Amino acid sequence: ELPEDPRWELPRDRLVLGKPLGEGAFGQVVLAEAIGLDKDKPNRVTKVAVKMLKSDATEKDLSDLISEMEMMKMIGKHKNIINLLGACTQDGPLYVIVEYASKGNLREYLQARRPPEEQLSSKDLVSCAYQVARGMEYLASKKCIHRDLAARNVLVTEDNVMKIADFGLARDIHHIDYYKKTTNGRLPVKWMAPEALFDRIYTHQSDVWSFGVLLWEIFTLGGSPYPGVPVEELFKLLKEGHRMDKPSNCTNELYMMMRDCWHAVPSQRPTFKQLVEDLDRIVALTSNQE
Numbered sequence: 001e002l003p004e005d006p007r008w009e010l011p012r013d014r015l016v017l018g019k020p021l022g023e024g025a026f027g028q029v030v031l032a033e034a035i036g037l038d039k040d041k042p043n044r045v046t047k048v049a050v051k052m053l054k055s056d057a058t059e060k061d062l063s064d065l066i067s068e069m070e071m072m073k074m075i076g077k078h079k080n081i082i083n084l085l086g087a088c089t090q091d092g093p094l095y096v097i098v099e100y101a102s103k104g105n106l107r108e109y110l111q112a113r114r115p116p117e118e119q120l121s122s123k124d125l126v127s128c129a130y131q132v133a134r135g136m137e138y139l140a141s142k143k144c145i146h147r148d149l150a151a152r153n154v155l156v157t158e159d160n161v162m163k164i165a166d167f168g169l170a171r172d173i174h175h176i177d178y179y180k181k182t183t184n185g186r187l188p189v190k191w192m193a194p195e196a197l198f199d200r201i202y203t204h205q206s207d208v209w210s211f212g213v214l215l216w217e218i219f220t221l222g223g224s225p226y227p228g229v230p231v232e233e234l235f236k237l238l239k240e241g242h243r244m245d246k247p248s249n250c251t252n253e254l255y256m257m258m259r260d261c262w263h264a265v266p267s268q269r270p271t272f273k274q275l276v277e278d279l280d281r282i283v284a285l286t287s288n289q290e
């Protein structure tokens with residue numbers, strides 16, 4: 001049933017499947033070892049992540065996983081996104097092979113580095129924002145709107161590189177359940193721009209608003225936005241023009257950046273291009289401590 005694409009296909013026997021990854025937040029995904037991923041080095045093994053359909057998947061689940069893969073083929077490569085590396089589409093279940101992120105999602109990474117391993121410098125945190133802003137600038141330049149940019153959808157590699165995940169996910173925005181929670185217990189509506197939340201209008205500008213929430217997540221080291229606030233109350237806060245408080249140990253400039261990202265008028269928010277330039281400059285002048 002699936003079309004062959006020699007640009008991406010890996011023989012099924014080259015992939016040694018392993019243990020589950022991401023505790024189900026990204027669907028059925030496992031760690032694997034791929035033999036001879038690079039055609040130049042056929043005797044090298046690479047740790048990779050591998051997405052597949054759950055046992056009782058419908059035909060729409062298959063379509064959605066295919067869309068995701070094709071979206072990823074078109075978007076191209078970037079250091080700060082989770083890149084496609086291959087696929088097994090023939091004679092067997094569909095496998096979508098992507099880059100492996102050994103240090104987990106950014107929320108977890110930050111939480112484990114709180115003072116009670118190695119604590120993060122002010123520069124490491126800004127550097128973190130910068131890398132994510134870079135991934136997003138690239139995605140935006142390729143006409144991709146994320147729709148759920150958040151710390152949970154940012155993965156961290158063994159070398160502390162931030163990579164945006166799930167940027168090509170299929171989703172029917174007219175059928176979102178605003179009350180559904182992420183497995184960790186939070187509500188995705190808390191990262192959504194008002195225009196996306198009330199009028200279902202997703203744009204690069206609404207992704208920029210989500211980035212503001214993510215900046216707040218970085219500077220609270222994995223803090224939870226609007227803790228205890230249920231959906232109806234969140235709407236009321238948004239309608240009243242409410243904005244989250246400045247995190248402690250966040251400069252006035254970075255708080256102002258968050259606020260700009262939460263501009264009530266979408267046209268007035270910065271773009272990712274501008275955010276990358278601003279963050280580059282702030283990284284250069286932020287203390288590593290020494």
Ligand SMILES: COc1cccc(Cc2c[nH]c3ncccc23)c1
Pocket residue numbers: 021022026029049051082083098099100101102104155164165166167168
């Ligand atoms: C494009 O983003 C994706 C696509 C497929 C799967 C995933 C989850 C994932 C990829 N690499 C990982 N490494 C560790 C934990 C989860 C993951 C993200």
